[PDB]
């Protein structure tokens, strides 16, 4: 009956800022995989992506929020959320 | 039997010391309540992983941590257990001797 | 009788993206012949191909579907589709 | 009883000047989480953060107040309070 759906994705520029949405019917989030970060409001995240994305969530909606600042093109790529695998979204970055 | 025990005892003592042959042995009984990052609801791949760090993955993805903490562990608990062989054999040559000056009927 | 055709080629700039489509009457992609990427949804890509290429595919059209982003002159290349071979399309970036 | 907020933070650009507030109904500073500075008036900072940074603190208001001077994109960080932890206060750097 779980079920794991993302949203907020698209395509932002340089520099930008980008806010990922998992609804929820521990999380942790990955990217394509490739392991990005975790939360419990204990947050811990990959050096490859440290200082640049914030995770915070409220049961109150049931629903985890990836704050990305500053995105690249470099980290173009389609991201999912693991509490079963989540769907995913695709990030392009031009 | 003293040279038959002095055989063995220093390749036990040494391999014990040097921890590497314990951790390769005993890396996949490690605990996981202790650390929040191996949940795994799968439970299996966190085995699959557990007893994969300790041998030669690498792959910094700053779990490495976690591994760098029960390595020392490992390494900690071997040391000590091989002190704690070299003293029971030591007691136990001790006794032993003791034992056959006092059952020895001969002068 | 089972026959696979390749579409969505064509000519496309620097940064751009393309759809490659192949439609079938486990499944793997080559260009020309260097391996590519693998589905089977457990999704597999080459490293000199990583963080580029996205593969899906679905049952209900019997077609696999190869997103790419990003393309450069230098992967400039036909390429197939192996489950058999696939006849392969010409793709060209200027 | 005892809560502590977290005020004055934002975006600022590249050569400005910020002004951190923590309300308290020895004071420490973290970024993310890092080490930042300490008060008791005797000061304590970082060297990675040495002379960019002042804290003072006054006991009529009940706050803590840390001047940042110069701050870069570098340092674009979330910034908390320890005492118990505050809340944190987002603070990018464009």
């Known amino acids: 009956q779980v079920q794991l759906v993302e949203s907020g994705g698209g395509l932002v520029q340089a520099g930008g800022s980008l806010r990922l949405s998992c609804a929820a019917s521990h999380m942790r989030w990955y990217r394509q995989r490739e392991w990005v970060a975790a939360i419990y409001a204990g947050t811990h995240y990959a050096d490859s992506v440290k200082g640049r994305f ?25 991201y999912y959320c693991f509490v079963y695998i989540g769907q995913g979204t695709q990030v392009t970055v031009s | 039997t003293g040279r ?9 003592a040494v391999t014990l010391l040097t921890g590497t042959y314990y ?18 609801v799968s439970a299996s791949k ?21 591994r760098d903490e029960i390595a020392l562990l490992h390494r900690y ?12 054999a030591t007691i136990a040559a001790l006794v032993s001797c003791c034992v056959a000056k006092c059952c020895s009927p001969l002068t």
């Open chain 1, 54 to 78: 914030t995770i915070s969530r409220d049961n109150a909606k049931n629903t985890v929020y990836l704050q990305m600042n500053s995105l690249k093109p470099e980290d173009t790529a389609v």
């Open chain 2, 4 to 12: 038959a025990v002095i055989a063995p005892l220093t390749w036990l």
């Open chain 2, 23 to 40: 951790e390769c042995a005993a890396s996949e009984f490690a605990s996981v309540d202790h650390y929040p990052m191996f949940d795994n």
């Open chain 2, 46 to 66: 966190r085995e699959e992983i557990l007893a994969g760090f300790p041998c030669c993955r690498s792959a910094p993805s700053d779990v490495i941590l976690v």
């Open chain 2, 77 to 88: 608990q071997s040391q000590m257990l091989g002190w704690i062989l070299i003293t029971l």
